[PDB]
Amino acid sequence: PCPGACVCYNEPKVTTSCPQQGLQAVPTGIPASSQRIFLHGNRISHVPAASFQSCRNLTILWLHSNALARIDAAAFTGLTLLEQLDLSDNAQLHVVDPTTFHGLGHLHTLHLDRCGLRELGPGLFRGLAALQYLYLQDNNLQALPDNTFRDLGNLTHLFLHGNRIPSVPEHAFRGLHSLDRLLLHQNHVARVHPHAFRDLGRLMTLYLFANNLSMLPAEVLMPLRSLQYLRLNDNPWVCDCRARPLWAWLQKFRGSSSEVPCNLPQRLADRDLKRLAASDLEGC
Amino acid sequence: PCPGACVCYNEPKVTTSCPQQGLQAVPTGIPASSQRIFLHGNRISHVPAASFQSCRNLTILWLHSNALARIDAAAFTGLTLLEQLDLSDNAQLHVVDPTTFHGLGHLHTLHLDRCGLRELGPGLFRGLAALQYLYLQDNNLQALPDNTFRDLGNLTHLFLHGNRIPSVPEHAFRGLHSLDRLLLHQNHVARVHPHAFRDLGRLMTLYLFANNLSMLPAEVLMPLRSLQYLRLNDNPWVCDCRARPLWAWLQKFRGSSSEVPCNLPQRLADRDLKRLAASDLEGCAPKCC
Ligand SMILES: *[C@@H]1O[C@H](CO)[C@@H](O)[C@H](O)[C@H]1NC(C)=O
Ligand SMILES: *[C@@H]1O[C@H](CO)[C@@H](O)[C@H](O)[C@H]1NC(C)=O
Ligand SMILES: *[C@@H]1O[C@H](CO)[C@@H](O)[C@H](O)[C@H]1NC(C)=O
Ligand SMILES: *[C@@H]1O[C@H](CO)[C@@H](O)[C@H](O)[C@H]1NC(C)=O
Ligand SMILES: *[C@@H]1O[C@H](CO)[C@@H](O)[C@H](O)[C@H]1NC(C)=O
Ligand SMILES: [Cl-]
Ligand SMILES: [Cl-]
Ligand SMILES: [Cl-]
């Protein structure tokens, strides 16, 4: 049975699609053998406790572009084979219970962008050893706590840009030894701990532009061994004695890096740091 | 002019006392000269923002034993001289905005016990540098995030018992250099990071009884130079080779420590670990195991 104006088909995968159908909640009568459920584009307010427990074969679930305000902690419980979970474009969700994603040992990608998330609870990403893609962009995140991604061993892409992150602690990115791309641009990053990127050995892309970075020690870039692209523009760079560590590292870096424009001093008229001579940096 | 009912007296402190009067909300027209406001015992469900502005000289605010459901983020904005805030016994409050306590640089004691608090948001205790007493007991806390009390450099008492805290991370208690009594009993504590007490040099009392502690490294108690009272009862202690580090630390501890009862093995059941011989702490029942 198809739960109404939905569309139900079996090839290639057992699919139940209910997109842009004025649904006010998760409909009743979804086939228990479904492997793909698309509830995007409706006005679903709450995801109750039961929801999708019947679908033991479920791997793809889309709930984006709804009116999600509350998601029960047991919303996706027992969905052992879930590979993709889409909750993006729900700017009125604001908060997720830290046990919501417990038990999803097969989850490959998790979309949580433009959800207005105020914070990331302790243990929110615990156990997600299968996670590869994590989208947390354009939320209201105001802190990046330690060990938040300690279990994401297979995580390759992490998107944190478009938040209000003020700093980076030491063990914030602990455990991400498979991370390839890390995007932190368009935040309020004013400081980074010297040893933050220690686990990022295979990181190839780092976007730090459009932040509040005044200076950056070379030590934070030392562990990055596979780095091939680096974005640092749109930052209040102070080019003097404090920039010499980053300056020396930038003369040796092999990959393609963006401009490092000096906000200060006034004498240096908005020039690139990589192209400055050693004798320009004075003023620790 | 004092509001309806209530009590307003000048000495010792300018007081607007309206307790146990059946108020449904904060009474309007509270005198601006008030140094102490007692609204406890009523049925106030919400506290709007700026509800106590104009009361610049306010130092004491009691809102306990009410029916609080939501506190506005700017409820205490402008209370630069508030010394004591009492929000306890509101087990339906559940959540407090992490910016609610910003600016209260003179706050000395903060009562948040029996509020139904579920978690502690980032920066909830930002800049509370004068805070000395923090009552967070008998709530629904499920985690003690790192750096939660990093700003509370003048805190001497921290009450966390009666929650459901499962562990103590590495930096849960960082920045608490003045801490005297830390109470963590009646929780779900199963493991403590060896360096969780690194900044607690002046600690004199530590309660850890009634938890699920199977073992405790000797390094966790190493920073506690000033310890005089330590409670470890009501824990499932495994008294085998893993307890030798804790056992040796207990042989040189000069303070008063409670009983450390053995859950396993059954031949040592309820024997005090301190009073066992080293030859008892052999075998297994886990590097040594
Ligand atoms: C899962 O799919 C198989 C076929 O691949 C089917 O036989 C089985 O009944 C399905 N079970 C559920 C719970 O959907
Ligand atoms: C995660 O990595 C482990 C090896 O560390 C591997 O066995 C497992 O298949 C990986 N899972 C995914 C979803 O990539
Ligand atoms: C606070 O008290 C001082 C003197 O004790 C007085 O000058 C000031 O006006 C008082 N403020 C208010 C709001 O009553
Ligand atoms: C902290 O307490 C000490 C006394 O132990 C006192 O001297 C100091 O002024 C206090 N600091 C603040 C910011 O309240
Ligand atoms: C018992 O200890 C375990 C750790 O082995 C912990 O996960 C669990 O929450 C504890 N339960 C209780 C009731 O203390
Ligand atoms: Cl797809
Ligand atoms: Cl840290
Ligand atoms: Cl319980």
Side-chain angles (χ1 to χ4, degrees):
Chain A
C2 209
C6 301
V7 177
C8 297
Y9 58 90
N10 292 30
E11 243 61 32
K13 300 285 179 176
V14 192
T15 304
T16 299
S17 184
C18 317
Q20 268 196 341
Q21 302 184 184
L23 292 180
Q24 301 293 309
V26 184
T28 67
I30 299 176
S33 67
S34 302
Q35 295 172 322
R36 272 144 54 111
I37 294 177
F38 304 97
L39 298 171
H40 65 278
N42 299 282
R43 303 313 300 178
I44 297 184
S45 59
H46 297 257
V47 182
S51 268
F52 324 103
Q53 159 150 345
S54 336
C55 316
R56 299 182 282 270
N57 286 346
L58 183 66
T59 78
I60 292 186
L61 174 54
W62 286 16
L63 291 172
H64 73 85
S65 300
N66 279 285
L68 290 187
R70 173 185 180 263
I71 298 182
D72 192 79
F76 324 117
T77 187
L79 290 180
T80 63
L81 303 172
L82 188 64
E83 291 192 24
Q84 293 196 6
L85 186 45
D86 194 351
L87 296 167
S88 62
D89 197 25
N90 283 284
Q92 321 300 328
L93 181 54
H94 293 310
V95 64
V96 176
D97 183 289
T99 60
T100 307
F101 309 121
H102 288 187
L104 309 178
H106 281 34
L107 187 64
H108 285 180
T109 86
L110 180 47
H111 283 274
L112 291 162
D113 35 310
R114 306 191 190 271
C115 296
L117 286 186
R118 302 168 190 160
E119 69 204 29
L120 303 173
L124 183 64
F125 306 119
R126 176 214 299 174
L128 307 178
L131 197 60
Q132 298 169 325
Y133 291 70
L134 188 52
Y135 301 87
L136 291 173
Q137 75 231 41
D138 305 325
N139 288 306
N140 209 30
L141 292 180
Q142 237 179 348
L144 200 63
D146 287 302
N147 306 315
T148 303
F149 323 105
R150 211 211 317 183
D151 293 306
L152 313 184
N154 289 335
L155 192 78
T156 59
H157 295 61
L158 178 50
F159 299 84
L160 290 166
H161 61 288
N163 295 282
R164 307 189 297 186
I165 297 176
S167 57
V168 176
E170 174 171 357
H171 311 287
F173 304 115
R174 169 66 198 185
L176 298 181
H177 52 69
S178 292
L179 191 62
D180 292 332
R181 292 217 298 171
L182 174 64
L183 303 196
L184 292 175
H185 55 277
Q186 299 170 8
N187 278 273
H188 297 162
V189 180
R191 55 164 194 178
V192 184
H193 181 262
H195 298 63
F197 305 151
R198 169 173 276 180
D199 287 73
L200 310 182
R202 308 182 65 94
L203 186 74
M204 303 188 303
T205 294
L206 182 60
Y207 283 10
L208 277 175
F209 67 94
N211 282 322
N212 254 84
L213 290 179
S214 61
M215 70 143 298
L216 209 79
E219 199 65 47
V220 69
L221 307 181
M222 295 301 308
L224 307 184
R225 227 173 191 279
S226 310
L227 190 65
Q228 298 173 340
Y229 305 93
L230 181 66
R231 292 267 200 85
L232 293 172
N233 42 310
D234 203 341
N235 286 280
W237 289 116
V238 174
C239 290
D240 50 2
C241 45
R242 84 197 70 187
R244 296 178 308 177
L246 174 58
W247 176 88
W249 184 96
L250 285 170
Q251 308 300 313
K252 195 261 165 185
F253 180 53
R254 303 291 197 85
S256 295
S257 71
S258 76
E259 191 128 340
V260 189
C262 311
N263 186 40
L264 295 181
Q266 29 274 314
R267 341 186 311 258
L268 284 168
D270 200 354
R271 288 234 296 171
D272 196 337
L273 175 62
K274 323 172 308 186
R275 313 170 201 274
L276 284 190
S279 53
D280 278 319
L281 297 87
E282 279 126 50
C284 292
Chain B
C2 205
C6 292
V7 174
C8 280
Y9 51 99
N10 286 11
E11 222 86 24
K13 295 286 187 175
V14 196
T15 306
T16 302
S17 181
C18 321
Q20 303 179 7
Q21 288 181 158
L23 287 174
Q24 290 283 286
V26 177
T28 58
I30 294 177
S33 57
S34 290
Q35 294 166 317
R36 291 171 7 180
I37 297 173
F38 305 96
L39 295 178
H40 63 284
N42 302 273
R43 304 302 301 178
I44 297 174
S45 61
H46 297 271
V47 175
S51 184
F52 308 99
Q53 233 320 297
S54 71
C55 299
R56 302 174 303 183
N57 291 338
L58 185 59
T59 76
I60 293 179
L61 182 56
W62 288 15
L63 295 173
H64 71 81
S65 304
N66 278 265
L68 277 187
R70 168 189 181 267
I71 293 184
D72 204 323
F76 321 119
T77 286
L79 301 182
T80 54
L81 304 188
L82 184 54
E83 294 180 338
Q84 297 191 20
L85 179 57
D86 191 355
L87 318 171
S88 58
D89 199 19
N90 295 279
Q92 311 302 130
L93 188 51
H94 288 147
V95 66
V96 177
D97 193 293
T99 58
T100 312
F101 302 137
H102 295 188
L104 308 184
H106 283 244
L107 187 58
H108 281 323
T109 71
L110 176 57
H111 270 93
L112 283 177
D113 37 314
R114 275 260 294 186
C115 295
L117 297 184
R118 301 167 182 171
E119 17 83 28
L120 307 175
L124 185 64
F125 308 114
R126 267 172 189 162
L128 305 182
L131 193 61
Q132 290 168 341
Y133 290 75
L134 188 45
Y135 300 89
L136 282 170
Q137 73 253 64
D138 294 333
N139 285 285
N140 193 24
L141 295 186
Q142 300 235 208
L144 206 63
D146 308 50
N147 309 322
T148 298
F149 320 103
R150 181 238 311 251
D151 286 4
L152 314 184
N154 257 19
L155 191 82
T156 50
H157 290 70
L158 179 54
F159 300 92
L160 284 168
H161 59 282
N163 296 313
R164 309 192 305 119
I165 300 177
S167 61
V168 180
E170 183 169 13
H171 300 147
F173 299 115
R174 180 159 59 181
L176 296 168
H177 302 108
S178 301
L179 196 57
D180 282 334
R181 289 218 299 158
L182 170 59
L183 303 202
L184 287 171
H185 54 282
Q186 296 170 5
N187 278 287
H188 298 340
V189 177
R191 54 179 179 177
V192 188
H193 190 266
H195 295 148
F197 303 149
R198 168 159 279 177
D199 286 334
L200 311 185
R202 300 182 71 94
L203 190 70
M204 300 177 301
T205 302
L206 176 55
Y207 285 178
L208 278 177
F209 64 96
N211 289 281
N212 243 14
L213 287 165
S214 53
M215 70 142 287
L216 198 76
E219 302 82 294
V220 119
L221 305 177
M222 179 212 309
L224 303 178
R225 162 200 168 180
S226 302
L227 196 70
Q228 290 172 342
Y229 308 106
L230 168 62
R231 285 214 215 179
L232 296 178
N233 47 286
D234 201 3
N235 283 290
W237 298 108
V238 182
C239 290
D240 54 353
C241 62
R242 86 192 69 201
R244 301 188 70 110
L246 167 65
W247 177 83
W249 183 96
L250 287 164
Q251 303 309 119
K252 72 171 191 176
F253 179 56
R254 296 185 173 187
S256 311
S257 82
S258 70
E259 189 111 342
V260 187
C262 300
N263 189 27
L264 306 177
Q266 299 201 125
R267 43 174 281 265
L268 300 178
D270 298 293
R271 306 276 306 279
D272 188 11
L273 175 75
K274 309 140 44 188
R275 314 171 195 271
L276 286 175
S279 53
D280 301 320
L281 265 20
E282 306 212 12
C284 192
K287 296 183 175 181
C288 64
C289 283

